[PDB]
Amino acid sequence: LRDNIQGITKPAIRRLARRGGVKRISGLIYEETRGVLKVFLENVIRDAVTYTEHAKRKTVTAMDVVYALKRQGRTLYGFGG
Amino acid sequence: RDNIQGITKPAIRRLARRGGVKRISGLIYEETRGVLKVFLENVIRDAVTYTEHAKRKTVTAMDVVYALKRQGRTLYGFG
Amino acid sequence: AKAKTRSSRAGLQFPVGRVHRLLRKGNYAERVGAGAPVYLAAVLEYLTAEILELAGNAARDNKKTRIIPRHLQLAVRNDEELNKLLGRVTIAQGGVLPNIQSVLLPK
Amino acid sequence: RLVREIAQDFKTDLRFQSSAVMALQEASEAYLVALFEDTNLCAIHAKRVTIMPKDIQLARRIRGER
Amino acid sequence: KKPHRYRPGTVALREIRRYQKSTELLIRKLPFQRLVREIAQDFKTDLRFQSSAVMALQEASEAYLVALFEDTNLCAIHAKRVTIMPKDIQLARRIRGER
Amino acid sequence: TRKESYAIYVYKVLKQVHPDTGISSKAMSIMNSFVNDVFERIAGEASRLAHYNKRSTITSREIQTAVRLLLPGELAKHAVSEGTKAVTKYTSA
Amino acid sequence: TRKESYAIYVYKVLKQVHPDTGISSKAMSIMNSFVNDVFERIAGEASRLAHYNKRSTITSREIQTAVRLLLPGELAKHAVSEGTKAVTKYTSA
DNA sequence: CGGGGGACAGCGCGTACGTGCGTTTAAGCGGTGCTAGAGCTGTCTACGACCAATTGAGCGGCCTGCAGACCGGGATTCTCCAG
DNA sequence: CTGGAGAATCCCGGTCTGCAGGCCGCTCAATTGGTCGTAGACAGCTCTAGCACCGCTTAAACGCACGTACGCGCTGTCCCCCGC
């Protein structure tokens, strides 16, 4: 598993910005977006894995993700509750 | 009764300076007055709620501490 | 006498007994008062009624007979107080409010 | 005086510990200073050295207060 | 005998309208799962994943990214511009408290 | 095993206000999660209130105070009215 | 009556790290507030974890997980080391 | 990959700022005085925990018809341009 | 201004299908009734601090004159992002 952050293609970020209400986009944005997304994903997954390990489990559940998001002040509905 | 005008422009300028602000427009002062008023309502409402639930008539500092804490603004040095 | 549900006694749709059980099992306090579960059930029922009413209005506006997450998001975000309450909540498959800034409009 | 005047549309005849008043002043001043610094950053981003209330509005909007 | 091309920006507005009404995910699922597993590799090996978990991460990330894009658009407009600059993103994240 | 939820009561309320409106499963789970979250918020605030006042009981007064603290304006007032009405009805009957 | 605090223990810690540095009352008041804040954060997170795994007991493992979740990086590592060492020493003693 | 239109650099200006001095004010301090109300104490009583027996509401499993999704083809709208 | 032209979108039948919702058996969690212990509701007492007042004092706010630099409008250039 190497070089997957390039998997987020430029059209994907373009669609994300269009949903975000962005009309004109600079070309040197996408790598910054990828870095920020990587930071966010790392922060969430760290706590998710911490929860999974404290339960002595080997698979990560969505419910662990729910707790991790809740502890970071980002509550998500519709994934088990 | 216009205690909102008790917040004179020198105090606003001083706060901006501590905030690292160099040049200030003249329209700023009233905007700060309004924003500060909104903040004060938000805190004081909860403070009075806590004071009333305790069936008290005097607001204690601990009430303000709880109100600030539940708003995401933790304060130390008062209990 | 025959058993009569406390929800019926207070005329509510939500299970007061389950609420009391959860209150006792949540380590919230040593003892739980008698009327507190009723109060909580009433509040939950009222809030549920509010959100469901707005979601149904939105779904009928979209001309569908079932409420989907999109309608829920629209109802929550369009209401000032509901959006204020759910300010830090992410709704799965909720989409976004179709809002466009004026300066980007073609002139 | 401003605090006492504000503390009238929730209840009447409210007594106050001094410590509550000073804690309110501390919190208010800290919040105002932080808002000022954010406003300064916003104005600088607009290639300016003078802050006008639209900067405050944008700062509070991004902060989520708005 | 003309290509009949639309002016720069109207297509952008049309796709903004398109994507502000939809709710589906905008990212390919397989690359996102691969990246998620790659990131998780650095915390614990041989980790298994429920699919609902990966969907949860995708939804949360896309929502957060949309919010950040909306804030960045406001920041850039404050600079009286139309194109988004990375400095706008940095300022927005700093103001949010993430920096 | 068996898991419980608020599905039946939510469906009842839906039929009460919009008798001719259906609901999808995902949305139904969304309401379930929403109810759970509100429950946790009110319960935690009530527990903090009780601990602050050095009390052993969670009464309806604490629930009302927590509702006032956690709800914005008109929502808080209407919820307080509903809770008081339900408490009065249950006490009478 | 009498109110307890952390003044003596913080004073001893200060004398360990800076055996000559004094302190003002406002500073140690802030110290006690910070100590209480951290205590409540960790204890609440530990209780949340225990309820998450359907367990009635709070052990040192729960506190270790809570500290790992609440403290960033090197602080978390060092605190884990301190807690482990103290636990091992107390058990051996 | 063509190209337009947006980013940006540079310049004029006039005014809304900053800066300093004379003036008025009200904040701050110290003192006196009063009492409302916080805080503490004894009591008992009503209310909540707890347990035994009962049962029916709600959860699990099954099934189904229709809401909604998916085609396709005209109908209608929106935008661009040449006049 | 203003028709055409072309592309984009809407809409209305027509068809299929997964799940929303209803039905059913069962069981365990809610209910009912009775016991008992004890938390707090309540009355009563104390005395602290919060409120109000007054008189000085002087630092700070205020008003104002004045001058300049900066925010803003305008213009020309180019490059780079968009439509395809």
mmCIF file of C-alpha atoms in Angstrom, chain C residues 6 9-15 18-19 21-23 28-33 35-36 38-40 42-44 46-49 51-53 56-57 65-69 72 81-82 85-86 89 91-92, chain F residues 4-6 9-10 12-14 16 18 21-24 27 30-31 38-41 43 47 55-60 63-64 67 70-75 78-80 82-84 86-87 89-90 93:
data_model
loop_
_atom_site.group_PDB
_atom_site.id
_atom_site.type_symbol
_atom_site.label_atom_id
_atom_site.label_comp_id
_atom_site.label_asym_id
_atom_site.label_seq_id
_atom_site.Cartn_x
_atom_site.Cartn_y
_atom_site.Cartn_z
ATOM 1 C CA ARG C 6 -46.969 4.894 31.975
ATOM 2 C CA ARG C 9 -50.861 7.288 31.695
ATOM 3 C CA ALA C 10 -49.119 10.445 30.481
ATOM 4 C CA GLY C 11 -50.542 10.044 26.971
ATOM 5 C CA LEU C 12 -47.213 9.770 25.146
ATOM 6 C CA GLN C 13 -46.035 7.636 22.244
ATOM 7 C CA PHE C 14 -42.571 7.007 23.687
ATOM 8 C CA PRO C 15 -41.743 4.235 26.195
ATOM 9 C CA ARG C 18 -37.516 2.087 28.696
ATOM 10 C CA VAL C 19 -36.494 5.685 29.388
ATOM 11 C CA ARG C 21 -34.396 1.858 32.594
ATOM 12 C CA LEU C 22 -31.865 3.721 30.453
ATOM 13 C CA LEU C 23 -31.675 6.523 33.018
ATOM 14 C CA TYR C 28 -26.106 9.399 35.583
ATOM 15 C CA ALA C 29 -27.069 9.430 39.264
ATOM 16 C CA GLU C 30 -27.592 7.118 42.210
ATOM 17 C CA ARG C 31 -31.387 7.421 42.075
ATOM 18 C CA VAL C 32 -33.793 8.581 39.375
ATOM 19 C CA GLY C 33 -36.884 10.623 40.159
ATOM 20 C CA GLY C 35 -41.372 12.245 36.837
ATOM 21 C CA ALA C 36 -38.021 12.838 35.149
ATOM 22 C CA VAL C 38 -41.856 11.285 31.732
ATOM 23 C CA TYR C 39 -40.442 14.767 31.165
ATOM 24 C CA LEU C 40 -37.643 13.417 28.988
ATOM 25 C CA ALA C 42 -42.315 14.193 26.377
ATOM 26 C CA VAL C 43 -39.422 16.382 25.241
ATOM 27 C CA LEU C 44 -38.111 13.710 22.880
ATOM 28 C CA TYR C 46 -42.103 16.849 20.862
ATOM 29 C CA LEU C 47 -38.748 17.283 19.133
ATOM 30 C CA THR C 48 -39.383 14.190 17.023
ATOM 31 C CA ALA C 49 -42.762 15.601 16.028
ATOM 32 C CA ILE C 51 -38.455 17.327 12.837
ATOM 33 C CA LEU C 52 -40.864 14.809 11.318
ATOM 34 C CA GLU C 53 -43.358 17.546 10.453
ATOM 35 C CA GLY C 56 -42.777 15.582 5.704
ATOM 36 C CA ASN C 57 -43.393 19.110 4.463
ATOM 37 C CA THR C 65 -44.404 9.895 -0.065
ATOM 38 C CA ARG C 66 -41.343 8.749 1.910
ATOM 39 C CA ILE C 67 -38.820 10.802 3.861
ATOM 40 C CA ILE C 68 -35.205 10.341 2.758
ATOM 41 C CA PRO C 69 -32.013 11.756 4.342
ATOM 42 C CA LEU C 72 -34.128 15.499 6.680
ATOM 43 C CA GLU C 81 -33.374 26.752 15.550
ATOM 44 C CA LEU C 82 -32.978 23.161 14.348
ATOM 45 C CA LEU C 85 -29.251 22.721 17.667
ATOM 46 C CA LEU C 86 -27.667 20.396 15.091
ATOM 47 C CA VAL C 89 -23.960 17.105 13.190
ATOM 48 C CA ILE C 91 -26.135 13.841 8.148
ATOM 49 C CA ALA C 92 -25.268 10.868 5.961
ATOM 50 C CA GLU F 4 -33.969 -2.242 20.590
ATOM 51 C CA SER F 5 -34.594 1.149 19.015
ATOM 52 C CA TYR F 6 -37.134 3.958 18.831
ATOM 53 C CA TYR F 9 -42.546 5.293 18.363
ATOM 54 C CA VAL F 10 -41.028 7.361 15.558
ATOM 55 C CA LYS F 12 -46.304 6.361 15.401
ATOM 56 C CA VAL F 13 -45.439 10.056 15.590
ATOM 57 C CA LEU F 14 -44.946 10.180 11.816
ATOM 58 C CA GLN F 16 -49.710 11.229 13.866
ATOM 59 C CA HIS F 18 -48.178 13.002 8.456
ATOM 60 C CA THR F 21 -46.015 9.788 4.573
ATOM 61 C CA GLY F 22 -43.622 6.848 4.498
ATOM 62 C CA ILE F 23 -40.004 6.707 5.589
ATOM 63 C CA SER F 24 -36.880 4.927 4.398
ATOM 64 C CA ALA F 27 -33.737 8.030 7.478
ATOM 65 C CA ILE F 30 -31.037 8.855 11.338
ATOM 66 C CA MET F 31 -33.926 9.719 13.649
ATOM 67 C CA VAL F 38 -30.430 14.196 22.429
ATOM 68 C CA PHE F 39 -30.937 11.662 25.211
ATOM 69 C CA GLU F 40 -27.224 11.687 25.998
ATOM 70 C CA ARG F 41 -27.046 15.481 25.967
ATOM 71 C CA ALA F 43 -28.836 13.115 30.630
ATOM 72 C CA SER F 47 -26.104 14.655 35.863
ATOM 73 C CA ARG F 55 -28.098 15.881 45.026
ATOM 74 C CA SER F 56 -28.815 12.165 44.781
ATOM 75 C CA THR F 57 -31.854 12.317 42.479
ATOM 76 C CA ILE F 58 -32.519 13.283 38.870
ATOM 77 C CA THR F 59 -35.938 14.932 39.017
ATOM 78 C CA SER F 60 -38.110 16.616 36.397
ATOM 79 C CA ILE F 63 -34.674 17.779 33.194
ATOM 80 C CA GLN F 64 -36.394 21.120 32.629
ATOM 81 C CA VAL F 67 -33.779 21.426 28.401
ATOM 82 C CA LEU F 70 -29.519 22.892 25.695
ATOM 83 C CA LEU F 71 -32.377 24.177 23.604
ATOM 84 C CA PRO F 72 -32.580 27.429 21.617
ATOM 85 C CA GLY F 73 -35.398 29.799 22.553
ATOM 86 C CA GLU F 74 -38.791 28.791 21.200
ATOM 87 C CA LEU F 75 -37.807 25.129 21.041
ATOM 88 C CA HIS F 78 -42.398 24.647 23.717
ATOM 89 C CA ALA F 79 -40.509 21.635 25.068
ATOM 90 C CA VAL F 80 -40.871 22.962 28.618
ATOM 91 C CA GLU F 82 -44.931 19.888 26.666
ATOM 92 C CA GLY F 83 -42.975 18.365 29.536
ATOM 93 C CA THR F 84 -44.960 20.254 32.159
ATOM 94 C CA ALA F 86 -47.197 15.561 30.356
ATOM 95 C CA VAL F 87 -46.014 15.597 33.973
ATOM 96 C CA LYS F 89 -51.324 14.634 33.165
ATOM 97 C CA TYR F 90 -49.342 11.689 34.533
ATOM 98 C CA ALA F 93 -53.787 10.098 36.303
#
